Amino acid sequence: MREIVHLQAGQCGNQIGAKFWEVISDEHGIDPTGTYHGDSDLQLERINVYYNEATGGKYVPRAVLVDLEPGTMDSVRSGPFGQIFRPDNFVFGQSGAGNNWAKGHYTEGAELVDSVLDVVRKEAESCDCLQGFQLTHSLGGGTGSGMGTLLISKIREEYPDRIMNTFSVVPSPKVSDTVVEPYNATLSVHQLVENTDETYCIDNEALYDICFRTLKLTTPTYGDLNHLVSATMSGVTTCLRFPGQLNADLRKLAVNMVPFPRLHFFMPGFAPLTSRGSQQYRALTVPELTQQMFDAKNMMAACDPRHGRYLTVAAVFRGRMSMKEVDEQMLNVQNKNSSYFVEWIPNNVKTAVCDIPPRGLKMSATFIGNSTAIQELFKRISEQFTAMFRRKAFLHWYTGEGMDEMEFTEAESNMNDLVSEYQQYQD
Amino acid sequence: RKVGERLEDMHCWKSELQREIDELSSETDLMMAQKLRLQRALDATSVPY
């Protein structure tokens, strides 16, 4: 069959993969130790999409974790699920990274690309057919961009017929912690939009707004943030692993979503959130599902798409529903606002229906969307870049490493041209 | 004609009886297995005492 090899990089990835994999395991009902116990015969059947079979009926994750700092490895091994990964799958360096994308893109990866490629293509040989890969990292990842750019560029020609989905967290507009972080973003995004097919973008400030708007829980953990994003990724991938009548495949989605080569970016958004009394006050119904489904409050990725226009929307529903209700739902929303949707395309709504519920809640859904509401992010980063660049701030590290200003010039050319691209389409 | 009608009417009940007996047996299997699991857990309990 056709399956998936998962890549996780940077300390961002070190959180995300651990949380996301334990989520999937708790879904498909396997103990952290490994021995299975059958309750959903269908979940027993459809397992080769992610898990290769190890004797004793254990199901090794076809995932690979890479970073440069051993302590994060130690933590993700000492967590509640550390036994579930392979001593094989821990490739690593010895030196510290320090968020210097220049070194991360030449000075340490140059000697570990060999090992990482060996292991990943070993898994590729192990399996039969691959959709492609998905990568969990951060573009603001101080090691994330450095490793990701190189490995992506290699795997492009390694398997040029595949689906290399990218899942990244965007640096916070209000605060970047690292001051060379705008440099990291501007440098990574060039190769990103030069290579990618589908890339997600999620911001944590709006997650904190979620914390004070529906979470209402005082003191959240970055682990719980990871829990939210893991639920989103799970939901977008559920269509492949379960029965019920819907179209599942990733590029099945992609051809519908993207209009043109350089369009690659999307926003996720989740479905019913609920405060402590709203559990015993929420009537779980298709209308309110669709309502909050389309909420600027629920919007959490970049900013309110109020200010831009939706090119395309794709929605997945999960549970025991029918279709006439979702049909009347979108019909209602296009008729409520046909102005907001673009005219260059009619019928910009796409739907899918997976019958199998997640564990615990019956009615569920999730979103993916392409809107003209992302100018803000990279425009912001553009002014940040121009400001710090105005008189060669912090530039000596990179000029000692081996970079030079011309590279920065074409990166900023890429960014500004893309801005004009998005605009003059939506205009 | 009357006797044929009677035959079909019997065949119905025969079918449902068979099916329900099958689910009953499966349930017996599951409960037996869980009981054995409980037994071995009781075995495990004693050491820390």
């Binding site: 459809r46 009548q245 051809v255 993207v258 279709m323 006439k324 019909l331 | -």
Partner: protein, 438 residues
Amino acid sequence: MRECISIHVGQAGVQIGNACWELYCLEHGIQPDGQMPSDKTIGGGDDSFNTFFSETGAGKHVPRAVFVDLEPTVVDEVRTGTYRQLFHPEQLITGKEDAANNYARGHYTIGKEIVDLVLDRIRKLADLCTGLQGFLIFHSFGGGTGSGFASLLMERLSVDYGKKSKLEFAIYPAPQVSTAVVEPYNSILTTHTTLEHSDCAFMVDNEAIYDICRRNLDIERPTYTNLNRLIGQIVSSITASLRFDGALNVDLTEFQTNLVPYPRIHFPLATYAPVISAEKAYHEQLSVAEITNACFEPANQMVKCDPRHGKYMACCMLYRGDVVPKDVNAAIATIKTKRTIQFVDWCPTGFKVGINYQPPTVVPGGDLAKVQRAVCMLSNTTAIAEAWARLDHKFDLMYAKRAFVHWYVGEGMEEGEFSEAREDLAALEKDYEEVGVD
């Protein structure tokens, strides 16, 4: 003798075939095991079933169908369902990848390799066949994958056998609902690469199905269960000619000869009259007059083309149940006299009557009422061109600025085909106005 072969492409069509057999088994009383009681009807396969099964001395009925799929999930589910012993173990072809709404992907990239297997299967059933009046192709026009595969298999069978029937049934695109904005592309691709071969095309729409459902059946959240049940009843009705006797008999070849007026335009509409719930039928009455009037009522059709916008060329109706020729002919005469229904000036007689005594059957635990008089209606009228105007003004808009075309041109097609299709359709609309004009 008398038999026909069913072909199913698409996780779309697997369902509606599944329901068709979920019905077809009950009427001749074949248990889901695949075996009757111990009586004496089995042999070389010679009794009622012989038109859709070849039950040899094995005592096991062979569903004369091929279920092909490219995404193993739903077909594997029917493999693990009840009827697995009924279905023939490698008539259930499964594939590993899909065409992803890309007609050209299905038409070149993956269409080249399953065709050998399907040709194998068709010939090695045709061997034991004797009469083989034709085939029933199940597909869709908004084909996520059923577009290119269906097109290429259809042309291959057209060029390997030329002298028999091809009947086409399809869920048609909605006037204003699209689950894939790639449908306005792939649908016309299918149409203008099938017209030169397709014998008789027929369309039906799920929205209008819903609308009938909540106007008269009082079902507010019906399903695919209900929709496929209705469609299965329709196809069973049109096959009742072979299945059961009657005052007269008609055939699918008669449908072809009597319905399509010209080469090209072969796109009529289908309708089923006595739709009503049991409770609603209970304290009312069904009779020839009102059932015929209702089946010509404009608000009971399953495609959004009001007949008043169009003009009738041909009408075929099959009465299934207990009816009599006296009131049959009286009612049709009254309809001819009725003013609003505007038949074109050509057809003096345009009414293929068909009669059969056999009462239609419910599906156990189904949805429909208990009916002693059904009529299934096929109608060729000019009202169709509205949807084609819809399609062309969608197409020119979203094509002139060349959105999404890069996928197709990369995976292997060019723009000449998309050039030719538009004027194919334009010639179709000029033909429609020319044929309408009197």
